[PDB]
Design a protein around this ligand. Sequence first.
Ligand SMILES: N[C@@H](Cc1c[nH]c[nH+]1)C(=O)O
Ligand SMILES: N[C@@H](Cc1c[nH]c[nH+]1)C(=O)O
Ligand SMILES: Nc1ccc(Br)nc1
Ligand SMILES: Nc1ccc(Br)nc1
Lengths: 415, 414
Amino acid sequence: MVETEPVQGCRDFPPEAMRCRRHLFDVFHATAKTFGFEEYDAPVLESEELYIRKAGEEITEQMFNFITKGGHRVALRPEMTPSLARLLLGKGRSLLLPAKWYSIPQCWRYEAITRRREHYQWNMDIVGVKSVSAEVELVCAACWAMRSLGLSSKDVGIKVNSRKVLQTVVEQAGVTSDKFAPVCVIVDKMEPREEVEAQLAVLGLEPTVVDAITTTLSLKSIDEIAQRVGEEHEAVKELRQFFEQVEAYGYGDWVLFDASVVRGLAYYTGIVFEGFDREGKFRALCGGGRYDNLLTTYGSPTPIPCAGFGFGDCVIVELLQEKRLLPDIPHVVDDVVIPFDESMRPHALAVLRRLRDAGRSADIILDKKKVVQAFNYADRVGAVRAVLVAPEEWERGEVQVKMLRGFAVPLDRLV
Amino acid sequence: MVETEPVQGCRDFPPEAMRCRRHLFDVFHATAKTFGFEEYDAPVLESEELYIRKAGEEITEQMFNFITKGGHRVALRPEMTPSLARLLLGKGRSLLLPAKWYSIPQCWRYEAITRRREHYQWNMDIVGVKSVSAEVELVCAACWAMRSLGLSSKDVGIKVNSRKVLQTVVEQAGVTSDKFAPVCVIVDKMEPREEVEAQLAVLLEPTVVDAITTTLSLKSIDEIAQRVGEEHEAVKELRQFFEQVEAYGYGDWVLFDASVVRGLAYYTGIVFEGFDREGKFRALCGGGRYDNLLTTYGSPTPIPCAGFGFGDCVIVELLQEKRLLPDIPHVVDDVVIPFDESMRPHALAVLRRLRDAGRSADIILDKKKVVQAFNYADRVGAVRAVLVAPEEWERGEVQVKMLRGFAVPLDRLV
Ligand SMILES: N[C@@H](Cc1c[nH]c[nH+]1)C(=O)O
Ligand SMILES: N[C@@H](Cc1c[nH]c[nH+]1)C(=O)O
Ligand SMILES: Nc1ccc(Br)nc1
Ligand SMILES: Nc1ccc(Br)nc1
């Protein structure tokens, strides 16, 4: 017998599981459409050179990579943002801005544990908008998706911060700019306190510079940030604008400030955010931020402002299961056409044709079955209606219909 | 600068191209739903052992395979049917039959060219149905999809045959059953006549080759009946098939062709493939019955299956030729325009309302003068522009313009 289990760390989606995934994706698509984002896609296979950022990111550390027969370094994408940037850079001058693009790529990782190696990740990005209205819209989109799935602001929130605060603190200490990305990557690991301080020292930062970083991540309000860097610091004005705009849109209860949020990606320059459950039970539900320099690093002759997020398919489902918002969605079909016997099969097919022409989902019983077994089958597939095509009714230009006693119905009136 | 081109043989789908792909997939999904099939999926990465069939298939010859860091032989799936079989075999007794399952996997191949290495392929399969009604439904589904895209029976058809005819001819000649799959794979190659005869010899004497050649050239079912009898399984089944398609109303879409075998080892019965009537393109779709596959995978009981694959590349070329793929421009219901930044908070409340009512809506995100905001609305294909200006706002109103303006109460926007 062949191996029935899927490849290590990968999921199968038989129909039952697929209906769940589809319920989730319906919301991602519908939210994107509500917010005016355009779908795109790109190959799961990208050049490895695309992901070499040299900041010690977990995402680059766990690349699912391999060498082609031709000898080229490729990888199954660990994330989508670089692919997006490649596409944007390809279009160059011909891309109309602003652009709002989304996708739901499967993304990949390798880990030596004998644990998940793939997930699907909703990506939403806004390109060509300098102002915080982008981040506002993005955070609202994430909340909208969660609310659409049945969650409330009692269940979840979005923690919001700006990396510009830390930038200034690190830059005031005399640390070269190139160290800033590594610092964010290290400080993201705070969620072992001694080991984080140790890694920062290896980066070449003295104890007092580490102290200033620690203190600023522990400041619990925007006013406290204001005391440290000033009320007219870019981060303060922008964070204030952000919260004012989310409040105006009606999602104020969903969002809050948290100075410890930095995210683990090298490329965020400004506002960063992540979704979380209010019970403190799960990892991040989604994550994102502004990354205004990425396209410049890729060689764009002009700077292109970008912001966006990723929203995974695994943590959200666990949360929905906990909150009892993922009831089993059973299969449905409008009609099941039942030939009384094989001599009625041709007539039954004409009926089936009609039903499908009118936009109805319909089965016909394919093998030889007795009527009552055909009826049981109809119930198993969740048919709303059984349509028995029997010789007596057929001579009267009729069929028998039963909603799941029967009724005789003219053919013309079935649809 | 980084490489902007995608990896060799792979396609990018920026929004314009993605809208085309989505138009196609909408039809695949909608056809599956119309026909009562259930969606499934499985990993693009499968074990290589899953595809080692040893019949010289093109599909096994061109596997995109590699070795993990852990040392396991894996591959990006060249097709979906083995993955389907794996899932079916996993469920075993607990799967309710009949089952009708579909998916739209990306599938992969490696070729030493300078040419496509990936395509998307609609798969539709019926599991647990012994009778030709399965193949009927499958062929009708394919036609339905093509008709849904704007094609007619003047544009395309489905050639249909049964491998059982050839089975009998080969088996009458004394050829061991294990040679039958290789014979089909070879005979599928009929488009170089001398080289096909040569490959069969490496496998069968000249007179056995002669009988194979003649039977592929027979132009009707009655002619098949003369050779193997009207009681031969292939004859009865093909007759039933055409009778059922006729009854469903797709008789003009289908026809008999004794040269159709397909290139896959596993087909046991009816096989079919879609084609354009102008003879310009490769096969549009292909499939057949494969009643032994699950048995080869170790199923303790035989499980009848039939299905097809329907690629995303040839169909699009055909639709482009027939001028059935007009550019689909982006659309959005509303574009909310703040008169200036002091109106942004009010504009956001309006945006919220519009979206609450099920409308697709943008708000102008950066600082723009009104006329530039309006131009932007037109570019994104907005049906309606909603200007939120201080004067109207004090009256509990906004300005609306369908793409002169009108003042409208907030309550009446939706
Ligand atoms: N690529 C980020 C998410 C993101 C999308 N756009 C911006 N950020 C991640 O994987 O966490
Ligand atoms: N796997 C086949 C198509 C198919 C699906 N089901 C049965 N046949 C192919 O790629 O040609
Ligand atoms: N980056 C990444 C990829 C795949 C999974 Br599962 N999680 C994270
Ligand atoms: N089997 C297969 C795979 C990929 C492409 Br492109 N064509 C055929």
